[PDB]
């Protein structure tokens, strides 16, 4: 304690200044204090004072029960000594990561059938924070999978390993501003549908992966 021993307030030495979390988890940011009597605490997000409700508790530990992407921001905590009114403050940057989200539904419950010979484009609209560091396409012959997420295929083939499937090309990524966010639009072109298959796009980023399975069943309607 300080040589002059009088009521005081200070932060504990271990205070973080960056905190990382993933969408959905509980976040805890402790305001560690030294001094006497126990200080009064107040939290601010980007300068706006926080009040406690069922979503967030702003006490000695700032607790966000289920962090969301909109919770990213700079949190300032101000400690006040209740006797002397001396104050200390500390800023914590909270960054909320998002594992890759694919907009198109992965639902094979009705199976998509295509006429023999047609050209079709499969698409994956991918959002992740940080952005995905790769987006890969995979495929499999329909016979080696189930139809009935039933993890339909036990093995997947890279679209580089295209022998025996449909003629396919992966287009360059495009980008779209959706819900205010830069989303990556990944497209696979099936040139002439002659082989029944399942296709999968997979996105990976720092905190997770996401995938979408697409059924590509081929039939020849006649007359």
């Amino acid at each position: 304690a300080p040589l002059a021993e009088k009521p005081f307030v200070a932060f504990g030495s271990g205070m973080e200044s960056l905190v990382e979390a993933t969408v959905g988890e509980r976040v805890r940011i402790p305001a560690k204090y030294l001094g006497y009597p126990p200080p009064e605490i107040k939290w601010y997000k980007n300068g706006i004072p926080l009040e406690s409700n069922h979503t967030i508790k702003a006490g000695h530990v700032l607790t966000i029960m289920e962090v969301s992407e909109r919770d990213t921001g700079n949190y300032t905590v101000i400690l006040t000594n209740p006797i002397s009114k001396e104050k200390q403050s500390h800023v914590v940057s909270l960054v909320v990561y998002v594992p890759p989200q694919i907009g198109e539904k992965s639902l094979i419950s009705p199976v998509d059938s295509y006429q023999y010979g047609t050209t079709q484009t499969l698409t994956c609209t991918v959002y992740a924070i940080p952005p995905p560091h790769h987006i890969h396409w995979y495929w499999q012959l329909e016979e080696e999978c189930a139809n009935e997420n039933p993890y339909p295929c036990e093995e997947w083939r890279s679209v580089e390993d295209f022998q025996g499937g449909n003629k396919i090309e992966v287009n360059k990524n495009q980008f779209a501003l959706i819900e205010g966010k830069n989303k990556t639009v990944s497209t696979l072109v099936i040139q002439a549908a002659n082989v029944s298959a399942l296709y999968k796009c997979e996105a990976v980023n720092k905190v997770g992966r996401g995938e979408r399975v697409i059924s590509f069943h081929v039939t020849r309607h006649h007359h």
Binding site: Y44, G47, P49, N74, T76, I78, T80, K87, S89, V91
Partner: peptide
């Protein structure tokens, strides 16, 4: 405008906290 940001993205509140000026930060509301 307490919410105005300079070209570094700082508000007056942010600036007051950078200086350790908590009494000012409480004013900047």
């Amino acid at each position: 405008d307490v919410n105005a940001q300079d070209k570094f993205g700082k508000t007056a509140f942010d600036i007051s906290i950078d200086n350790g000026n908590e009494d000012l930060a409480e004013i900047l509301q």
